[PDB]
Amino acid sequence: SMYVPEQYRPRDASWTLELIRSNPLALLVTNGPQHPWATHVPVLFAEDLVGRRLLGHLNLMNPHWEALAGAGHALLVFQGPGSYVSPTVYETAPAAPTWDFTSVHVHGALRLIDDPDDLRKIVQATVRAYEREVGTDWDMSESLEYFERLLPGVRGFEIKIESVDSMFKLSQEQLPETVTKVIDSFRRSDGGRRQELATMIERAASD
């Protein structure tokens, strides 16, 4: 499981849920010969997280799909904004650099889905979910026929969540004044995803 120093644990579960929804392209990781299998996959909630279900899909021709048959359990890694923290920002000495970042590791029991009806439901639900969340409210109606043409090439999976580790490493180990410097320094830069990161740092520091 992911080791999270106590100071980097989320103050609210909403941080975890949001991070997952905001960054639904997870890394699906299962044991393999000599090292694990790892695939970037689009997941979404089925409808505190324990017992809920994450649905996902991937390429039928991806060898990971074949490997999934021998695995009872899996890990899904979600990552949000993150960035290097240069001590120059602290304006203090001595110091050490660090990396501020956000990530959620979901542990769960794995289930395989190959029924075309279930897969249609999944891919359509993914479009709706992403379009609302990360998207532009695109209408998929005129494309449903097209989806059918694609459907035999897709396979899916379900993960019933058994444990969740949440890492919100947002400079909380720093004094409030210094954290203020880190936030401002990230806000003064245009490079993504430091704007969003700065906002998360501020959120962790507020009341």
- Give residues in contact with ligand HEM (CB under 6 A): 3, 39-42, 57-59, 62, 84, 96-99, 123-124, 126-127, 130, 147, 150-151, 153-154
Q: Indicate whether 31 belongs to the interface with its own copies (CB under 8 A).
A: yes
Q: Residue 14 or 121: which CB sits closer to ligand HEM? A: 121
* Long-range contacts, 3-7 (Cβ 8 Å, 24+): 3/165, 4/165, 4/166, 4/167, 7/172, 7/173
Count the site residues for its own copies by CB under 8 A.
76
| Cα–Cα distances in angstroms (integers) from residue 39 to residues 2, 17, 119, 122, in the given order | 18, 21, 18, 18
**Among 18, 22, 32, 180, which residue sits at the site for Cu ion (rule: CB under 5 A)?**
32
- Footprint of its own copies on residues 86-145 (CB under 8 A)? 86-89, 93-97, 99, 101, 103, 105, 107, 127, 130-131, 134-138, 140, 142-143, 145
User: Minimal distance in Å, beta carbon 89 to ligand HEM?
Assistant: 13
Q: How many CB atoms lie within 10 A of CB 81?
A: 22
Q: Indicate whether 155 belongs to the interface with its own copies (CB under 8 A).
A: no
Backbone angles phi, psi at 111, to 5 degrees: -130, 140
Rounded CA-CA distance 106/41 in Å is: 14
Nearest to 91 by CA among 174, 173, 200: 174
Rounded CA-CA distance 90/92 in Å is: 5
Rounded CA-CA distance 45/20 in Å is: 9
Q: Indicate whether 7 belongs to the interface with its own copies (CB under 8 A).
A: no
- Footprint of its own copies on residues 38-67 (CB under 8 A)? 38-40, 42, 59, 61-64, 66-67
User: Minimal distance in Å, beta carbon 55 to its own copies?
Assistant: 16
User: Minimal distance in Å, beta carbon 172 to its own copies?
Assistant: 16
Rounded CA-CA distance 105/24 in Å is: 12
**Among 21, 52, 53, 107, which residue sits at the site for Cu ion (rule: CB under 5 A)?**
107
Q: Say which entry of ligand HEM, its own copies, Cu ion, none residue 57 contacts (CB below 5 to 8 A, set by partner kind).
A: ligand HEM
